[PDB]
Amino acid sequence: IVEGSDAEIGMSPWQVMLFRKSPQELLCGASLISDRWVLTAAHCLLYPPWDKNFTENDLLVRIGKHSRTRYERNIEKISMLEKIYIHPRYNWRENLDRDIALMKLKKPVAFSDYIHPVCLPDRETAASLLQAGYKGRVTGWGNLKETGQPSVLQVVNLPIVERPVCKDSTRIRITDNMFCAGYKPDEGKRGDACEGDSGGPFVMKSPFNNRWYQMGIVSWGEGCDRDGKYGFYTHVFRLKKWIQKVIDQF
């Protein structure tokens, strides 16, 4: 996260760290959506241009974390993956269209002060909240700059940007399964996700029922926090039929 601040303890209890078993390292962000399901970006698991194609056994999920590198004994829970499910129409060849994946845990994680699931939006919550100017929150342990690493989980609040402005900021084809967020050069405020934050959640606090909803998944950006550029997020509600289908089966 670029130009963010340290998260408060238990501020993002749905935050999940995707962790490589060997070599032991941060792979991506992710989120807890139930006691046995974790949501992330498909590119965190499958990205052929980088020879990335993980199996369940290559990964671990670390829940309830605050410190990036330390083993948070009696606070974090480390979980094994039973199965990975990637959107069948995930477009890794062009623009990361449908950049979404689900990971089923081998055993349910126990909820605590530091571990709690985020809600997924229904049609009405998405219609109400997904509006240009409305701000969401992005969290992660990724790079603090495009070109170090944080000691603890980082947080940044960012405004949703108008679809024409998102399209006009890039040469990449932007789909209806994406939205972009961040400040314009003229707004005098900064902030963005960066390498290592991908797969992480973009959340909004509904003013109707005071619950936190995951509206987006950190997907991609042309660098990090560059003037005139924006962060691109997977539109969670647009892919809910697939999410529901996966969780209904298996």
Binding site: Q24, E25, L26, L60, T69, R70, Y71, I78, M80
Partner: peptide, 10 residues
């Protein structure tokens, strides 16, 4: 850079 995690998880 990462502190070692318990062996049971590996």
């Amino acid at each position: 850079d990462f502190e070692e995690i318990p062996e049971e998880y590996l």
